[PDB]
C-alpha cells in the first residue's frame, strides 16, 4: 500500500534506532518533543493496524515497545511532575492504545496512573462548573487540548477495563467541553480563561480530539447524539479549516500546530469507519469520503523523491511530515 511506502520512508528518514526516538527534523540534531513523540507513537500503531504486509506489521509491532522504551530512558516512567496536563494525557492515551495492541500490563498501569493523576487532581468545579486545567503548576485556563484528549483516554480505559468510572469520566468531560469549549454547532474553541473568557480560535487538532471523543462516546453508549456531534465538527472542519480548493490548511509557523493534521486525520478516519459501518448520515458520509480521498491524494502527490511529504500539502520536520503518513494509514 501507499501507507507502507510512506511509513517506511518516514522511519528511514526520522527514526533513530539507538535512542529509540524520532529525530525532530532531517538534520538529525535533536529528538522530537515529548508530546509529539506520543503522537508519532500512535502513528506507528495506526500503520501497524493498516498494513497487510506481515513483515512490516511485525517490525512496527516491535517499534511500539521501542518508542516507549526510548522515551522512558530519556525522561523516566513518572511524567506526573510535567506541568502540562496535556503532556501527561497524550502519553496516557498512547499507553492505553499500546496495551490494546500488546497486552503488556506496564502500558495499562502507565495509562491508568497518568489518567487518574490528571482527572482526579486537575478536574475542577470551582471554575466554570467543571473541566480540566491546562497546567498543574498554575490554574488560569481550561483547554480543548487537555479536555478532549482526556475524554479519549477515558474511553480507551473504559474499553480495556469495562470500569464504568471511565465512561462516566469521558461523559462528564465531553459534556462540559461541548458546553464551554464549543459553539454547540461543531466549532471547537481553543480554551476558556478565568479573566478573559472563551478564546474561539479553532485548529485541526482540537477539531480532531473532539470528533474522536464524540465517536468513542457513540461506540460506548449507542447514543446517536454523539455521532451528530462528530458530524457537525467534521462539517465545520471541511468548510473552514481548508483552502479554497478544499485541501486542509497549513497551520505553521507554530511548532505544536504545524503537524496537527496528523491528529485530525487519525480522528476523521474513526468517523469515516463509523459512518461507513452504521449507515448514519449517508449523504454526508459519501461527500466526506470523497473529500478525505481528495486530501489523501493531494498529500500522496506532494512527496519529495524520498517519499516524504512536507505539511504544506498545497529541511523536513517529522511532525509536519507525519500528517501525510497518517492520511495514508487510515
Ligand atoms: C501542552 C504541551 O504539549 C506543551 O508542550 C505545549 O507547549 C502546549 C501548547 O499549547 C498551547 O498553545 C497551543 C497553540 O496556541 C496558538 O494557537 C492557538 C489556536 O489558534 C491560539 O489561540 C494561541 O494563542 C496560539 O497562537 C494552544 O492550542 C493550546 O491551547 C495552548 O495555548 C500544549 O497545550
Numbering used by the authors: 39 to 352, 359 to 374
Kindly provide excerpts from the paper associated with this entry.
GH76 enzymes catalyse the hydrolysis of α‐1,6‐mannans, such as those found in the yeast cell wall, with net retention of anomeric configuration. In 2015 their 3D structure and putative catalytic itinerary were identified revealing ‐ in the case of the Bacillus circulans enzyme ‐ five enzyme subsites “‐3 to +2” (using the described nomenclature) with Asp124 acting as catalytic nucleophile and Asp125 as catalytic acid/base in a classic Koshland double‐displacement reaction. We show, notably through mass spectrometry and high resolution 3‐D structural analyses, how the disaccharide cyclophellitol is indeed a poor inhibitor, but how the trisaccharide versions, in particular the carbasugar‐stabilised one, potently inhibit B. circulans GH76. We used a more easily crystallizable variant, R341Q, designed to prevent formation of an intermolecular salt bridge due to crystal packing and allow ligand complex formation, but which is otherwise unchanged in catalytic machinery and efficiency.
In order to test our hypothesis about partial occupancy and ligand hydrolysis, we harnessed the D125 N variant of BcGH76. This is a variant of the catalytic acid/base which is inactive against unactivated glycosides, but which we reasoned would react with the 6‐epi‐manno‐cyclophellitol epoxides, even if at a reduced rate. The trisaccharide binds in the −3 to −1 subsites, with identical interactions to previous GH76 complexes in −3 and −2. In the −1 subsite, the 6‐epi‐manno‐cyclophellitol has opened (or is at least subsequently observed bound) trans‐equatorially (as opposed to the more common transdiaxial opening), Figure 2. The mannose ring is observed in 4C1 chair conformation ‐ one inconsistent with the proposed conformational pathway (OS2‐[B2,5]≠‐an intermediate initially in 1S5 conformation). However, in the −1 subsite, the pseudo‐sugar ring of the manno‐cyclophellitol is displaced from its position in the Michaelis complex with its ring plane rotated greatly (beyond perpendicular) to that seen in the natural substrate, to such an extent that the oxygens equivalent to O3 and O4 actually lie 5–6 Å from their positions observed for the Michaelis complex in a position that would not be possible for a natural substrate. Whilst other trapped cyclophellitols we have observed appear in conformations and positions consistent with the known itineraries of the enzymes, this is not the case here. Arguably, the active site mutants are not able to hydrolyse the glycosidic linkage connecting the manno‐disaccharide in 2 with the manno‐cyclophellitol.
